């Protein structure tokens, strides 16, 4: 069902089911499962609704999908409108953490075209 | 070499079955210096093949090497543009050597999930004249026969 | 008890320094044990050889600091007032632990 996940995480292991959602990695996955009595070493095939209602309650505390993407977009646009170094490097599509633009940084900059 | 002929470093029999050919087999199949992991997959594939096929452990690799054992090799006599494939009777060291290189390269090429499965499949398919190593052996003999300008 | 420890720069200077250290105590009358080897330290130094262009060439030097341990067993009155002051070993850093 719609357990605050982009889509149904079925046919995969319980830890992998959580990692396939936007906003939760392996650490938050083990945290949600350990604090709800889920079996981390099995798959979610034929999982009872009672153990899923506690997961549905648990996941809602930390930031959900879309609202997190909007939080990152808002945090970036704030620096863009402000006019700082982090805003200008973002609008001009170049690295901000000190990566060289001489040869590398192709992922952020873009494909080659001499 | 140029000054004198040099034969490659001789080996001793393997620690499990006492065969000098299996010692060369595990050495060629070895990767990154990990001899233990290599012999573990070789013994595992040999045991699973001897159990599945029902034949003896000796014939489980002797008949598989025999079906991929060539009887002629190619000499580069330069006739066809500075390179050629004149056939001549292969020497015994080279006879078992080319067979092991082909069956190992075929195990590397095979698309099975596990190296033990890739090896037990190539070892099974070889003895019934259907494997990739059999295709390699039964292509060089044809090319050598087609390029038999001399003998 | 008198744990003499010698530190020199040459193999043919410290065995000769501890030769008189064994003879001027054994002869006069005391209890003396032989010299303990105490492993030599090898300090390496690798530096660039060419001044203005040097990519893969280097010159390699090293120093071998030799060590010795005499460890006089009993500190008798004969060896206490006769052991040192006569070797003239200026290139041997002696150290004594009681």
């Amino acid at each position: 069902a719609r357990i605050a996940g982009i889509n149904i995480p079925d046919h995969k292991h319980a830890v992998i089911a959580l990692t396939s959602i936007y906003g939760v990695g392996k650490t938050r996955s083990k945290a949600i499962l350990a604090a709800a009595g889920i079996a981390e070493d099995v798959k979610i095939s034929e999982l009872s609704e009672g153990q899923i209602d506690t997961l549905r309650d648990e996941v809602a505390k930390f930031v959900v999908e879309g609202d997190l993407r909007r939080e990152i977009s808002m945090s970036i646009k704030r620096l863009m409108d402000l006019g700082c170094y982090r805003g200008l490097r973002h609008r001009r599509g170049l690295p901000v953490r000190g990566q060289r633009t001489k040869t590398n940084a192709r992922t952020r900059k873009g494909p080659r075209k001499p | 070499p140029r000054r004198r002929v040099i034969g490659q470093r001789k080996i001793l029999p393997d620690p499990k079955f006492g065969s000098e050919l299996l010692a060369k087999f595990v050495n060629i199949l070895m990767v990154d210096g990990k001899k233990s992991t290599a012999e573990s997959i070789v013994y595992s594939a040999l045991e699973t093949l001897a159990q599945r096929s029902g034949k003896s452990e000796l014939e489980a690799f002797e008949v598989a090497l025999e079906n991929v054992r060539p009887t002629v090799e190619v000499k580069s006599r330069r006739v066809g543009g500075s390179t050629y494939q004149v056939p001549v009777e292969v020497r015994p060291v080279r006879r078992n050597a080319l067979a092991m290189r082909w069956i190992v390269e075929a195990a590397r090429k095979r698309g099975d999930k596990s190296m033990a499965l890739r090896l037990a499949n190539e070892l099974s398919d070889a003895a019934e004249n259907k494997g990739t190593a059999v295709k390699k052996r039964e292509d060089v003999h044809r090319m050598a026969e087609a390029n038999k300008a001399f003998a | 008890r008198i744990r003499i420890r010698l530190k020199a720069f040459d193999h043919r200077l410290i065995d000769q320094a501890t030769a008189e250290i064994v003879e001027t105590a054994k002869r006069t009358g005391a209890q003396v044990r032989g010299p303990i080897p105490l492993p030599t330290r090898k300090e390496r130094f690798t530096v660039l050889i060419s001044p203005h262009v040097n990519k893969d060439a280097r010159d390699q030097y090293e120093i071998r600091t030799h060590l010795r341990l005499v460890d006089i067993v009993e500190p008798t009155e004969k060896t206490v007032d006769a052991l040192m002051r006569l070797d003239l070993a200026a290139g041997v850093d002696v150290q004594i632990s009681l």
Binding site: - | - | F45, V47, L48, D59, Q60, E62, I63, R64, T65
Partner: protein, 96 residues
């Protein structure tokens, strides 16, 4: 020789003990809090140039800031110059 770098370095050596090495530990205890209070501002008044972080190790003879060796107190070509002419004790060639 480039007298500037030598003059600056000699000045920083004395001035790095005249102000620093005694009140730097006070900055380490108070500003980097150990057990914000207003006593931190009085410990940031130290000279900017005289800081040990600015001091660069240089050769004893020519003041060369590159190729220096702390142990022998010289540069690699100065260690090589003395080493070849037998002036450094026991610095034999390494040939193991």
């Amino acid at each position: 020789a480039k007298q500037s770098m030598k003059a600056r370095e000699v000045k920083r050596v004395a001035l790095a003990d005249k102000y620093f090495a005694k009140r730097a530990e006070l900055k380490a205890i108070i500003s980097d809090v150990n057990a914000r209070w207003n006593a931190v501002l009085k410990l940031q008044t130290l000279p900017r140039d005289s800081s040990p972080s600015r001091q660069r190790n240089r050769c004893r003879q020519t003041g060369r800031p590159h190729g220096f060796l702390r142990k022998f107190g010289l540069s690699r070509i100065k260690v090589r110059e003395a080493a070849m002419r037998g002036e450094i004790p026991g610095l034999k060639k390494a040939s193991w």
